Design a protein around this ligand. Structure first.
Ligand SMILES: [Mn+2]
Length: 478
């Protein structure tokens, strides 16, 4: 994004906090090169010269204005992807009711009752529950008023910069690279869900290579589906971006919103409008108000879907900008936000695509260090996706999502107080695919103090999850 204005105002929107994460018993055993992100400039771990807001907004180094020709190409790619998307999902894209937007529907989680309400409510000491009845799925007069402004396209708002309390590599922690959540007003999230939540629900339910989206997938179940699909192709590329969300140019965002969320695909006219309010945004950090043109705000509602859609269009765009005769069946891919796996039988020169991604303001690099850039010949078993490898389970012959042990060690080394038992059961679901020896080793520090699921129990759970028929078939003989 391009920072076009910065000004100081009277109202100080607080951003500095103390971490809720503490080391666990596993920290002393694994000693990970990971720690809680700095949530304050006074944090002693920070390097000299580090000012949080400067580092946080340093990713905004311009809004790439695409040529007329490139925008035309982009719109064709956006429309072609949209065509695939709405062919698979259908056109049942009318607004959710206020009740449905709050309470959720099949394939769309309910709204969080006690997360940050955003501005100006945070400054007024009003929590989300003061504005919305999450039990009954109704809204108070303030939100009702705001919804009318959105209906009339007169609604304006500021985003609240919220520091992400999370574990990061210590290199990034000390550099002040604390990630953020751009907290939009609760009514904006509500209306966005009203406008495109039905579409988002359908995206989740139809996740896969066909629509190029893994959003709403269950890695336990879907690694078999994804792994088997990508194993059929000669080439598989693990592509990485740098600041994917920040570098979405306004042209790309606008054109995507225009082609994907058209009224002819069942959307209300304000679906495009409310999405377009994400393009030029004002961000509150303490007394500073920073206006950014371009880039996707780091939200938690429709952000992953939007980023996933753009990722799909980018690949089509880049390939078509370099090669002639490129269509959606020239390659295959799946994406979750910035994360992406691409495959094709064609020897696609991904190194040569670099400048074409650059015309979108995006910088692509291979997942591995840089073996003289991108290369052909890699398979599904070489790549990572959602921090998970595609490994073959010897017991079943199904693909399983295997996380690196150092990742799991880092995850296990920290936790929010009072949540550890819950976290361990969750992480056990991730760790089971590493095998019984590694599973045992990872949870050994917690044995006795907490209930650790048996490897056996999680393996059997997984077998049925990935293939119920296989689980059944194993009981045919004594
Ligand atoms: Mn990657």
């Amino acid at each position: 994004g391009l920072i076009v204005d910065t000004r100081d105002v009277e109202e100080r929107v607080h951003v500095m906090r103390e971490t809720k994460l503490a080391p666990t018993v596993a920290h002393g055993v694994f000693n990970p090169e990971f720690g809680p992100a700095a949530l304050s400039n006074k944090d002693p771990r920070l390097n000299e010269g580090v000012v949080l807001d400067e580092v946080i907004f340093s990713k905004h180094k311009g809004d790439t204005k695409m040529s007329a020709e490139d925008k035309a190409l982009f719109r064709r790619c956006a429309a072609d992807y949209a065509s695939r998307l709405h062919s698979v999902l259908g056109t049942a894209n009318a607004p959710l009711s206020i009740y449905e937007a709050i309470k959720g529907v099949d394939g769309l989680d309910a709204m969080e009752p006690d997360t940050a309400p955003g501005l100006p409510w945070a400054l007024q000491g009003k929590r989300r529950g003061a504005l919305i009845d999450f039990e009954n799925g109704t809204v108070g007069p303030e939100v009702e008023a705001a919804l009318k402004l959105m209906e009339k396209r007169e609604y304006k708002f500021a985003c609240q910069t919220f520091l992400k309390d999370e574990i990061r590599p210590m290199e990034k922690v000390r550099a002040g690279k604390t990630r953020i959540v751009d907290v939009l007003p609760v009514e904006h999230i509500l209306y966005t869900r009203m406008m495109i939540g039905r579409f988002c629900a359908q995206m989740h339910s139809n996740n896969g290579p066909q629509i190029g989206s893994a959003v709403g997938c269950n890695p336990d179940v879907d690694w078999q589906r994804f792994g088997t699909h990508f194993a059929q192709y000669r080439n598989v590329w693990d592509v990485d971006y740098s600041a994917f969300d920040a570098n979405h140019c306004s042209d790309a965002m606008n054109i995507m919103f225009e082609e994907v969320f058209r009224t002819e695909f069942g959307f209300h006219p304000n679906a495009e409008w409310i999405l377009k309010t994400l393009v030029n945004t004002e961000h509150a950090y303490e007394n500073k108000r920073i206006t950014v043109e371009g880039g996707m705000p780091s939200g938690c509602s429709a952000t992953s879907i939007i980023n996933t859609i753009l990722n799909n269009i980018y690949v089509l765009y880049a390939l078509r900008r370099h090669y002639e005769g490129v269509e959606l069946d020239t390659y295959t891919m799946i994406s979750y936000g910035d994360d992406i796996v691409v495959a094709s039988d064609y020897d696609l020169d991904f190194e040569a695509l670099k400048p074409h991604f650059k015309s979108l303001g995006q910088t692509i690099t291979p997942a591995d260090k840089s073996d003289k850039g991108f290369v052909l010949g890699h398979s599904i078993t070489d790549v990572t996706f959602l921090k998970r490898h595609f490994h073959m389970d010897y017991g079943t012959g199904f693909y399983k999502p295997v996380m690196a042990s150092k990742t799991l060690e880092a995850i296990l080394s920290f936790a929010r107080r009072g949540t550890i038992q819950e976290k361990l059961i969750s992480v056990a679901g991730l760790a089971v695919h590493s095998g019984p020896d590694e599973y045992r080793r990872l949870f050994e520090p917690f044995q006795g103090l907490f209930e650790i699921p048996s490897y056996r129990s999680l393996y059997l759970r997984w077998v049925n999850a990935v293939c119920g028929d296989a689980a059944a078939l194993e009981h045919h003989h004594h």
